[PDB]
Each structure stands twice: as structure tokens, then as C-alpha cells.
């Protein structure tokens, strides 16, 4: 509903200091389409593996198939672009809280 | 066409150190639709006023008439943030340049 689970699909650079992130949402087999839940412009609260530290990303694009795009610019020093360079990989699971459309 | 002259409609102080920014991109009277050429998901590249500095914001929604929506978390000591935090005000005009949608 608001709490999901996401699997890392993809995590690659895309200029020198950009990563573009794929996740894709995990339901139920049998449940209503993902698509359903995620529109292009919202956002979600992603949380770091093995902390409660969050951060909010823009949705991209979603794909038919569920799919949920980000695009991430790295800075020095924080906490979800360390986590992005030093611990994410395809394959890991990370929570989301949302999605939402303002703050 | 790819650079834009926008004025600042709606700038304001939401939940968790994040500003909603809510951008009036400007056309000639009986233009074609803004809304048609700008979609949330996409980002554009705004600059500072007196700058050259610019940053990239995710359109997390459009208005029919073009009014984009930008959630901005305010960075402690960033160049955009500071400029949000402190100088940005209704009225003003911003440059940018977009829409895009990958790198
Ligand atoms: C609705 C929404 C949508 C967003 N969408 C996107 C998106 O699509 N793409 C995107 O890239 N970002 C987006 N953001 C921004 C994003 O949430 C993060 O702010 C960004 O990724 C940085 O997080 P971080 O954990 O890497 O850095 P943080 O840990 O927050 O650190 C940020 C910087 O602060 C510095 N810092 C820490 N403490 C201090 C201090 N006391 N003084 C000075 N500097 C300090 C750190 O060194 C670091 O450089 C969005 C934000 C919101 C609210
Ligand atoms: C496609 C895309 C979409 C995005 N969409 C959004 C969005 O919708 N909302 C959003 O909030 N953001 C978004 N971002 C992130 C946004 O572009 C900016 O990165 C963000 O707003 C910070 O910009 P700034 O000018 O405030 O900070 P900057 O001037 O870039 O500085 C950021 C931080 O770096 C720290 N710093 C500088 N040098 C060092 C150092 N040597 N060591 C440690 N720390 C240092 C500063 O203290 C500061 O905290 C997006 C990024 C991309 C690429």
C-alpha cells in the first residue's frame, strides 16, 4: 500500500557523477499491476539497507512490466550516494514508503 | 524550444527541510500547450540567478498550462539550496533549459 519492497534491477553510471537505478517492485503473485501503484513524477522514501536513513528519489519513467526509474546524482559524502558506490547491488532488496506527490 | 524563461509562482517551506517550487514557464499569448511539450518524470536544468550554476529537478507534476511543480530538499550549505533557502521569491525569473529525460 505504502510500504513496498524493491528489488535492485539495475545500478550503472550515466555521466561522471549521475547513476541511473532501476528497481522493481515485488507484490503477490496474482496482485493488481504494479503500474497501478507508480507514476512518472512521483516519488518514493527509499531506505538504506540496515539503517533508517531515507531518502526521497523521483520516479522517472515506470515500465509496463512495473519498473521504476531513478536518476541520482552522487555527492561527496552523503549517505545514500555512499550507499549507491560502496553496498548497492543488483539482486539486493531495499524498502520504499510511498509513492507520494508532495511534501 | 530547449531553454525557457520561467517565473517562480509558488515558493514555499513544506514538511522535512523540502521547498515546494511551483514554476509558470512563459510563452506568448496563443502559444502551443506548454503541458504538451513537459511531463512529469522528466527534469530540467535550472540556473541560479546571476550564475552560471545550474541543477537538475524532477517534475513531479504539470499543469495544463504548463505550471511545473519541483520538490527541492533544501542541502545544508548547496548552491541551489542556499539560493532557495534565502534569495528565491514569487515573481522572479528563472532560466531553464529541458526537458529531458536520460542522459
Ligand atoms: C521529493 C524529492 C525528490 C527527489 N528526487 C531526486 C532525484 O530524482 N535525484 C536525485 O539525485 N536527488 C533527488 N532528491 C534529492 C535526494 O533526496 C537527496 O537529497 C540526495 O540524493 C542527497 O542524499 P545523500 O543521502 O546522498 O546525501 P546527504 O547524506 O543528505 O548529504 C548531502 C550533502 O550534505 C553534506 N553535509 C552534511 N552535513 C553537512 C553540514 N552540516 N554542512 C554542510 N554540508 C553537509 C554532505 O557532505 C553531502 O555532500 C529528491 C529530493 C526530494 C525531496
Ligand atoms: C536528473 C536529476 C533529477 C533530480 N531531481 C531532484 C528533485 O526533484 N529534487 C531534489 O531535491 N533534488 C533533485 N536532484 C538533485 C539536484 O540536482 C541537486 O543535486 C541538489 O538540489 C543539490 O544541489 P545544491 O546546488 O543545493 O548543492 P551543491 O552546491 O551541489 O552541493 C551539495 C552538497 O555538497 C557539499 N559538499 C561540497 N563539497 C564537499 C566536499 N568536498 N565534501 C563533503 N561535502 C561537500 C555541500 O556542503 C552541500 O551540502 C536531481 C538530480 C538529477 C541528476
Same mark, same amino acid.
Given at each position: 500500500?505504502?510500504?513496498?519492497?524493491?528489488?535492485?534491477?539495475?545500478?550503472?553510471? %550515466?555521466?561522471?557523477?549521475?547513476?541511473?537505478?532501476?528497481?522493481?517492485? #515485488?507484490?503477490? $503473485? *496474482? +496482485?493488481?499491476?504494479?503500474? &497501478?501503484?507508480?507514476?512518472?513524477?512521483?516519488?518514493?522514501?527509499?531506505?538504506?539497507?540496515?539503517?533508517?536513513?531515507?531518502?526521497?528519489?523521483?520516479?522517472?519513467? %515506470?515500465?509496463?512490466?512495473?519498473?521504476?526509474?531513478?536518476?541520482?546524482? #552522487?555527492?561527496? $559524502? *552523503? +549517505?545514500?550516494?555512499?550507499? &549507491?558506490?560502496?553496498?548497492?547491488?543488483?539482486?539486493?532488496?531495499?524498502?520504499?514508503?510511498?509513492?507520494?506527490?508532495?511534501?
Amino acid at each position: 500500500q505504502t510500504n513496498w519492497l524493491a528489488e535492485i534491477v539495475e545500478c550503472d553510471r %550515466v555521466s561522471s557523477n549521475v547513476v541511473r537505478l532501476l528497481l522493481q517492485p #515485488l507484490t503477490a $503473485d *496474482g +496482485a493488481a499491476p504494479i503500474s &497501478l501503484n507508480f507514476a512518472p513524477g512521483q516519488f518514493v522514501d527509499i531506505e538504506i539497507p540496515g539503517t533508517h536513513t531515507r531518502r526521497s528519489y523521483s520516479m522517472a519513467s %515506470v515500465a509496463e512490466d512495473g519498473r521504476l526509474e531513478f536518476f541520482i546524482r #552522487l555527492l561527496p $559524502d *552523503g +549517505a545514500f550516494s555512499n550507499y &549507491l558506490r560502496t553496498q548497492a547491488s543488483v539482486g539486493q532488496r531495499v524498502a520504499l514508503r510511498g509513492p507520494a506527490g508532495s511534501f
